[PDB]
């Protein structure tokens, strides 16, 4: 048998205290009033006694929404400490107004009435508290190093972290931002950004800061959703602290705000400046119009160069037209690259190369102009710039090596006897790599398309899982390469001994697969695709044990890399894709908005190679914001209106009515 | 709500007729240029009203054919209207389900 | 006539399905309080 | 503008009829009574008038659970047609008892009060109706061909199908089976089986019959769940209309009933007859005990043969011991098969073959004994028997060909010059195929294991999707084989012309890949695994267009079969596996129960090759069933107890109370 | 790590299939075993430039069936010097059935299992990781083992 008792004993209530608490719970006003009046004379009942759950009479009255018994207890001067917090958490308006006019706790000591009200996100109570003079402490910098912060962190890390989280929960309240905020949209943007930064910094409590940031983002999107006319939307998006506020939203990665339907509709009307009815057109009509504009891109560029003020001069400044012209220019560049492959050491550039050169110069000039104008952080935040930098550097190296070979060689020697590191060979290799990168650069244009955009977003996301798997794969590969090279480096053979004077795995009969570490890495790589034959694990000597051990290392590597690792990669990608699919549209619309806005600026109008040849505004914004806040508050109250405590309140009301009727009769 | 809809249709009430999906009259382009948000909202509200299963149950000679053609038109609008695509899709699906339930 | 029968049946079925929120509890509290005030005034 | 009017007009209510219906809705008893009394004298209000929703006064009273107004309307003789159906569907006890003591409809004409009550599955109302003399029509056979069935089907298929579904919904009611059923468990078993058969037959309404069958299965499982002692469970499982009822449940594929925890616990206690504490033992102890019993299987078999009544004679009749002995016997058979491969035309059988022969004879004798004892349908329902039949036939063919080669050949001729269809070669090929099948037969033992059982169930399920994909793959394969053979059959070359006198794709240099249809099918098969080289699409003639077209056919086949079809197969399997995973345990426990019960019988005790050398019972069952039904009814009522109409009823009660108080005051 | 359990579970069924087909192929082909001298380069087995004797012995048969999983076993190893076209066809059919099972059926079933298991684990991945990292951190809280090798000796 297990004896069961009370390990942590407490002070039990008396019979009368239990009867009085039961009367308070049942809502019988008459008996509670009689007990309160008798306690003043006889002092037999402690009006501040708790219950087995820790609640006092005032807490019971608050929990039952019994304003009459609550006020009766307040008129008899019961202990009221922290009762305001329970009233605020219960989200009962009568209790807060009753207590505002005047031990164990469920609330941490740093919780204040206004902070708790902001946590509940209850507009009525928050407004009641902000009607007075209340303040919320300002959190320090995310990476602050002042004496107070480090002292509080060292004295009590848990308390300090809890207090910071409570403050940020209060500040991120949509109702508290609706009131007491000059610019709710900008406040939500910057607060969400700061919460995301805190989530990055705070390894723990990461989920809570992430959800607070998401809540701020949704509040900004919902404020934008309350706009009822295009005039209001234009006023909001163009406000300066054009499309200034839209650019600010893009800076803070407010994807839901940017992808809002009305914002996208306005952006689309700006995108198709020339064509008023592009929305309602057939596929063939759109394709023919695009082909015509693309084929006429050089004419539009020349017209802009000569006279910008004409039917053709300013026709290229339209964003969709500019995008078409730039795309057509790049397509012609790629076509010339393809044509460029249809004994002189350092030959002069051909006609195709002479035509290619201005495009390369234009690419370099455009990149450096973007660096000079936009800045450094903006330039780096665009990943494509990395590929653009690689392409430009490879092209510059190609030109340099071509010049070197032109001014250092004159004779015409057959390529068979050229040096391995001859400048022409290196130049051609670099040019071929640049061609690959240039053709691959077309991926970034998938953003412009409805069917290819979200797919590109998804594949981008899956590249992160692929990179994560790359580390473990490379560790395994290096391990087995070390083992195989250690086993086989004794049997290295000269190229002369080979049947065709060819050494390595790129010969018709593969050999010396594991003789050197570099060759071993290549062999293990090519075995992933099955291009390494099994006889490479064989040696001329009759060392059958060595051959078997090498074959077993090779087989274990195959099993791991193919059966285990590749399938695990499929499972990871399969799962990651499923996660991303829900957000694919929002993510795509954000990326497409960035692409569209990149064509709104005056700079960079000409594609290569042609590029080398306040008070009233605030007032309007304030009135629009006031309307938006009213609409949002009404809508969210309606949504919340449209628990066991409700049934408890219903029972309390019925019992109070019953006791009143019974007493009256 | 069938009761309230019936109460209002007991009187002489009308709902404006939406223009063609690819209409190019002066009124449509004028309203689109003056206020695109208001025009799009009004069109969506009208189609939400018309696609109501209760409003099709009353005030419709052939509820099945009305639901068929209204769902088709809503699907076409969903194709044309790049934004608000989800709302037109769900209105079309609602009309299809109403026909199936009839 | 077949369509009339179908519409009657569909309306009845959908009303039944809908019949089979916080505002409901607010309405219940409102009814109870109105009854309480009427009784208190009468007595 | 769209004019909106009432296309299907109706008869509007008068002002007084609307006021009276509003009074009924609000529950004001006094005004409704006054209106009813005034209608008798002045005839100004139609007491049977509908509302805009079609409800009359009685229907409104029923829907609000207002028994007083309901009884008042009944005392004034209002129209009552189909009101009982609305009362039953509302599941209100007072309304049913009120109406039992005494146009458009929401219920089809075939619905009767008892049928609707069974549909609601409400025990109180069903009991109230069964207290009288009520009957439900008996549905005909699933494949009945009488005159009435075909006449009703041809006259009105919709009405007939609806009536049949309504009848089966009534009969499959757990409450209606709890009452009015001699044996609820057997009734649920056979009714679920019949509903599953109807679901197969009825292509439409398949989902409804499937869910009715599942509901019956769950009712049987829940009745078994109410057992409170091992005596009750034994009485239930052993009842005969041992473990008779468990065998009946297995026959009707009642997987949830068989897999119930207490049933599995009892079966486990029967399974480990010899070892009382096998449940609590270490892995090493269990493994050592299994190895010992398995190594001693011949001793146990001989002991059973000599004296069945001894410590060793009857030790093999225990189910787990018998399973271990049979498994060890099969393992030794496979070990001898492996050993059997460590110039005489038709040689005499070796020592290993002489040892193998009695095992084969034992397998054949055991199969024919199972066929003779169990029956034909039971023999066929076991899929493994198909593989057993194939193994036995291949072994018999092997023995026959060995005999033929022994009695038709005496000389010792080298195998190089033997005929292609020499009896010894065919015998060896058949024996090798039999060895493959025999070793593969061990899959069926995965059921016995906790970790391998559910996995085998899942792979079995995935074999159905693989078979489904097999049809489309074979269609594609046949199509492309026809095309490639048509293109290439002109360039067929003789084997002499080949470099090594080898023709076909199994040569070191593959050739004639598509010369014949049979060879083309094999080539397309082996290209799935990449074993067909690309040069087989080349011909000696300089027909570069023909070669290119053949290479394009081959490439399109590769793209389809590998990129498209194989990935689609992965998606199907991936999805099917996810479906099965939830039911994997129940399915596995059913299969393991079948395996365990197969070792409960006296017949087949000896493994190969040693096999070739009532009123009181019903009363007890009835009392146990009565207790189970009481417990199940109480439990399901509790579960149901633990909608907008509830709030409507609350408002109705409050308003009725308010009107009564106001009238009294 | 979690997916390694599903891989181990699949290992048993794969090994059963592999052993079955190795027994069958070795039984069929062990009559045509040839000496290493008869080979073109005095090399016997599947690790030669021209593969041979793929199924002559059980050990070699197991290795051949293993390497066919990665496609490194050529199809001509199912050919014999004698003109026993029926034997060659039966051996090629055993080899093809093994390929179909192990690659089309078993490998895809393994992908489905891993795919499902990964989805199960993903929810608990963080808690599980933090437990493991806590164990790693606590292993460095003790005085013993402060010096890493070779300074610990
Ligand atoms: C984003 C990429 C930017 C970088 C551009 C790529 C590098 C551009 C720089 C190119 C200069 C390379 C040296 C040229 C010298 C020619 C003569 C010579 O002395 O050869 C010497 C060796 O020469 C080499 O080793 C060249 C190595 C080229 C590596 C390119 C890898 C990057 C490709 C993918 C990127 C030896 O000659 P010797 O001793 O006389 O015999
Ligand atoms: C579940 C499986 C049950 C069936 C068992 C398998 C069949 C058993 C029956 C075997 C009898 C086969 C004929 C033997 C005759 C020998 C001499 C002879 O006349 O050869 C003749 C041809 O012989 C053949 O064509 C044999 C074909 C064997 C097919 C086996 C396929 C099934 C393997 C997987 C299953 C021709 O000889 P000739 O004209 O003198 O030159
Ligand atoms: C010694 C001999 C060597 C011989 C080598 C010969 C072959 C060379 C060919 C190498 C191939 C490189 C492949 C790069 C292709 C990148 C394609 C990614 C496209 C994609 O779906 O994701 C987008 C990637 O954009 C991006 O982030 C930018 C994409 C490119 C970034 C990386 C640049 C690749 C090239 C780097 C140098 C290579 C030199 C070659 C030697 C989305 O992402 P998002 O930008 O919208 O992100 C959002 C906010 N973060
Ligand atoms: C001309 C030359 C030819 C040369 C050929 C050489 C190679 C021959 C080798 C062929 C390989 C056959 C593979 C069969 C393996 C079946 C394994 C299935 C195991 C599995 O997971 O599913 C179980 C299958 O049981 C079952 O349903 C029974 C499994 C076996 C049924 C099919 C029998 C296979 C053999 C048929 C004849 C083959 C002759 C070979 C020429 C579960 O299912 P469950 O029973 O619990 O179901 C429950 C109620 N339905
Ligand atoms: C990330 C860490 C993962 C750890 C996983 C480890 C698994 C290692 C297994 C290495 C398994 C490596 C097996 C292997 O080298 O043969 C080749 C060697 C040399 O020719 O031959 C032998 O080792 C002799 C035995 C041949 C039978 C191989 C048994 C096959 C077992 C599993 C195959 C699985 C295939 C799946 C379809
Ligand atoms: C079930 C029905 C499914 C229908 C699907 C049809 C797709 C058919 C495509 C056939 C695609 C067949 C392409 C093909 O024979 O080359 C080989 C031929 C002959 O040597 O060469 C050529 O045809 C010349 C063009 C070579 C470029 C091939 C372009 C590749 C296009 C797609 C490859 C996809 C690979 C995926 C990673
Ligand atoms: C775990 C148990 C699973 C049981 C599954 C069994 C399936 C066994 C099928 C064996 C299928 C084995 C087919 C096969 O040996 O050819 C090779 C043989 C010998 O060269 O050639 C022939 O058998 C002659 C017929 C060639 C046509 C093959 C038909 C292809 C059928 C299915 C291919 C599926 C590929 C999927 C993309
Ligand atoms: C696919 C193979 C044959 C290579 C062909 C190279 C190019 C000819 C293709 C590859 C990607 C294509 C681009 C993919 C993305 C788009 C977006 C597309 O924009 C739209 O979808 C219209 C709506 C809009 O953007 O306003 C304009 C065509 C374009 C540039 C495509 C132009 C033709 C491109 C460059
Ligand atoms: C796996 C490779 C190396 C082939 C080896 C062949 C056999 C030696 C293996 C293959 C499958 C194994 C069987 C798989 C299933 C079981 C169930 C197992 O039963 C239990 O799990 C104990 C609990 C119980 O069944 O009561 C008894 C061992 C046995 C027969 C195993 C015995 C050993 C077997 C036959
Ligand atoms: N260095 C480079 N900057 C750019 C910007 C746009 C572009 O067109 C494309 F179609 F590739 F996206 C090509 C390039 S290359
Ligand atoms: N023809 C055959 N009937 C049976 C029944 C059980 C058995 O043991 C195994 F371990 F394979 F399941 C083998 C066989 S073979
Ligand atoms: Ca750039
Ligand atoms: Ca059997
Ligand atoms: Zn600080
Ligand atoms: Zn118009
Ligand atoms: Zn009949």
Author numbering:
A (entry chain B), D (entry chain A): 17 to 118, 135 to 273, 286 to 386, 394 to 664, 706 to 734, 739 to 761
B (entry chain C): 154 to 255
C (entry chain C): 715 to 734, 739 to 761
E (entry chain D): 511 to 663
Passage from the reporting paper:
It is reported that riluzole can activate the transient receptor potential canonical subfamily member 5 (TRPC5) channel, which is a nonselective calcium-permeant cation channel. TRPC5 is widely expressed in the brain and kidney, and serves as a potential therapeutic target for psychiatric disorders and progressive kidney disease. TRPC5 channel can be activated by diverse stimuli, including external and internal calcium, trivalent lanthanides (La3+, Gd3+), depletion of intracellular Ca2+ stores, reduced extracellular thioredoxin, hypo-osmotic buffer condition, indirect pathways like the stimulation of membrane receptors (receptor activation), and small-molecule activators like Englerin A and riluzole. Each monomer of hTRPC5 is comprised of an intracellular cytosolic domain (ICD) and a transmembrane domain (TMD), which can be further divided into ion channel pore (Segment 5–Segment 6, S5–S6 for short) and VSLD (S1–S4).
The ion permeation pathway of riluzole-bound hTRPC5, lined by pore helices, pore loops, and S6 of four protomers, is constricted at the lower gate formed by I621, N625, and Q629, similar to the apo state and clemizole-bound state, suggesting that our riluzole-bound structure is in a non-conductive closed state, which correlates with the relatively low open probability of TRPC5 upon riluzole stimulation (NPO is around 0.4 at −80 mV).
